[PDB]
Symmetry: C3
């Protein structure tokens, strides 16, 4: 059975600071299922589309070039309420506003270096997933512990 999916990316500061495993570990631990993962240095043009709603923000151009300046881990995670719950796990947009226990709360300080991205809605998630993954790159499989995560 297919459940809600979200797009999660480890940003270049996340890769650079050796936080990839730690982030993935947190999601496995939570009980969510990895459905897609790739490792790329995406194009400025891809990122511009990824962040289209902020295109008019002053930090937008720096943001888009920066997010394309190095490799990122692109992920798709699956599970009930994974979009909003992933956000909670991340913390807030600004690390300064993120609680200890969250990923941004434990590991970073500034809004422009906040190591992780997550879709903010099912609508954004469906678009971001389609943007970063070809349908074939999404793997359908059954986690055997599923019966201990879901009634």
């Amino acid at each position: 059975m297919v459940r809600e999916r979200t797009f999660i990316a480890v940003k270049p500061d996340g890769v650079q600071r050796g936080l990839i495993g730690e982030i993935i570990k947190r999601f496995e631990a939570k009980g969510f299922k990895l459905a897609g993962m790739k490792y790329i240095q995406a194009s400025e043009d891809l990122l511009k589309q990824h962040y289209i709603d902020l295109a008019d923000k002053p930090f937008y151009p720096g943001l888009c070039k920066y997010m394309s300046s190095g490799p990122v881990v692109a992920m798709c995670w699956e599970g009930t309420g994974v979009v909003k719950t992933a956000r909670v796990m991340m913390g807030e947009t600004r690390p300064a506003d993120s609680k200890p226990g969250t990923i941004r709360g434990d590991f970073c300080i500034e809004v422009g270096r906040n190591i992780i991205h997550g879709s903010d809605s099912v609508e954004s998630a469906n678009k971001e997933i389609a943007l970063w993954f070809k349908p074939e790159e999404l793997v359908s499989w059954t986690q055997t512990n599923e019966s201990w995560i879901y009634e």
Copy 2:
């Protein structure tokens, strides 16, 4: 030398997902003293009594069967304000409402699979402990680091 006591159980999903040590470790780190522990697959009826106050809820009979379907770690933990603090450490009834940093927040998703139980009051704690433990099974001992936990 005797302090407040609460009943904590690692539920069958907690056991299945290999979270026993992780749960106990959090209680040791916090500074609480272990007073009783056993490992059983309890009878459906023991669970019916454990959750007697929920007998009229629609999820109750299923709850009781699930909670008796596999082994659980039954514990009694001791220390100042341990009943309510354990609740804080667990999170909310619903993992969806539990914060990162809490046990349900970090490890589970669904209300019916929330890996851990904790007494909600001293009075419930007194009843749950007597139900799961024989008086002889509660161990009286002194943790020597106590003087660094308690003024």
Copy 3:
């Protein structure tokens, strides 16, 4: 280049309970920079000054001798908003009011045994750092991952 600094101390219960590495590790993970560290058993007189604004509290005299009864780790940490953020990472003054994920939240129970100290303002931090460290003992240096922590 030069950022805000705060004074953090591992208190005698922290040292005694073997939590020094855990605490330091939490600050390294967050991205803050160590500028100073020493390990001393300070004088009652130094502590009376350290806590001078609390001079009228009934717990003040007990506090100053306890904080001088054993070795503490004295530290200076540097980074954007490190005064307030360090406080957040600690939790609240009372471990009872501190959330899971914070240092007091994960590790302590009583207000008098809350293992860590942190300056409550840039002003107090400037005084406490100056109280505990000689200008020569403060290290000014550049962490090479700094460019992934700060725009």
